[PDB]
Each structure stands twice: as structure tokens, then as C-alpha cells.
Design a protein around this ligand. Structure first.
Ligand SMILES: CC(C)[C@]1(CO)CCCN(c2ncnc3[nH]ccc23)C1
Length: 167
């Protein structure tokens, strides 16, 4: 039993809800929140910009130190950093950005990072400003993630479309 509330169950381990991941993180304080990161951990917009703003820029400060030490992430890769006031940990995961021409097959590799964590609150990878089809992102998620994932979908219209078309 965990503290997540109001989700629709898609499968044994995948759940979905119309929610702002920032407000959801602040209420649940999950062990792991997933950020829709880029390789430079520059949290300017989309989910990343929103999560970072909610940390009063502490996420960006921590991220800049991480990059200065380690260099950029790989597309499809991840790193674990602090969750600040939102979660115990933030798993920064880099899905391919279609608007940069990155290979969509890397979306499966991106979701594989979730399997290192028993329970996660997460957005749909490569959705939104990353340019991929969110119905495909949900499908890859379901077919790749085996741990318990709670997907927060900001757009109510998109949320309803994701459910009604799910197989
Ligand atoms: C389609 C999908 C990739 C998105 C909608 O879920 C697109 C728009 C930005 N994304 C967010 N998702 C959940 N919570 C959020 N809070 C602020 C932004 C945000 C991801």
C-alpha cells in the first residue's frame, strides 16, 4: 500500500492520472519523481522547468555541479539527484527529443531506467515539448517498465485521449 490517490490502473504495475506532477509531488512526497531531463540538465521548460521552479532553482544549482563534474548524460540515460522539497530523489531521465532529430527507439532505453526503482511518480517521457506521440510513449512505458509507475498527465484533454485509446 502506498499514498498515491485517484489513479486509473492500466496494467498490473502502471497507473495514470490527470495531475500536475509538481502539485502531485508536493502532496505525495514520493521516494522518486522522474524529471523529463535533457543531457545538459538545463531545466528551462516543460516538466523540467516546472519541477525546477518548484525547488526555487535548487535543482538547477545541483544539476550544474553534476554536469561540471561528470559531463552530459546520454540520450536514453539517467542520473539520480536530490528530490529537494518534492521527493526523496529525482531520477533525471533523457528521452529522445524529436524536435532535435533524436532516434525514437531510444525511448525504450529511457524507460528502462525506471526499472531500477520500485515505485516512481513520472511524466510520459518524450511527450510535450520533446515532440513524440504521447500514445506511443504510454505504450513503450507499459511494455518496458516492470516496477510500479504512477504517470501524471498535465493536460486533461490528453489524459482522456490516452485512456480511451489504451489497449
Ligand atoms: C505529453 C507529455 C509529455 C506532457 C503532459 O503530461 C506535455 C506537457 C508537459 N508535461 C507535464 N506533465 C506532467 N506534469 C507537468 N507539470 C508541468 C508540465 C508537465 C508532459
Amino acid at each position: 500500500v502506498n499514498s498515491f490517490s485517484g489513479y486509473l490502473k492500466l496494467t498490473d504495475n502502471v497507473y495514470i492520472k490527470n495531475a500536475d506532477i509538481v502539485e502531485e509531488a508536493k502532496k505525495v512526497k514520493p521516494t522518486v519523481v522522474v524529471n523529463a531531463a535533457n543531457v545538459y540538465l538545463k531545466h528551462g521548460g516543460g516538466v523540467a522547468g516546472a519541477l525546477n521552479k518548484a525547488t526555487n532553482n535548487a535543482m538547477q544549482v545541483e544539476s550544474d555541479d553534476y554536469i561540471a563534474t561528470n559531463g552530459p548524460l546520454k540520450v536514453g540515460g539517467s542520473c539520480v539527484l536530490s528530490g529537494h522539497n518534492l521527493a526523496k530523489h529525482c531520477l533525471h531521465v533523457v528521452g529522445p527529443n524529436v524536435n532535435k532529430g533524436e532516434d525514437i527507439q531510444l525511448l525504450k532505453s529511457a524507460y528502462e531506467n525506471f526499472n531500477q526503482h520500485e515505485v516512481l511518480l513520472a511524466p510520459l517521457l518524450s511527450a510535450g515539448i520533446f515532440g513524440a506521440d504521447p500514445i506511443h510513449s504510454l505504450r513503450v512505458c507499459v511494455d518496458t517498465v516492470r516496477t510500479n509507475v504512477y504517470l501524471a498527465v498535465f493536460d486533461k484533454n490528453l489524459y482522456d485521449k490516452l485512456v480511451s485509446s489504451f489497449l
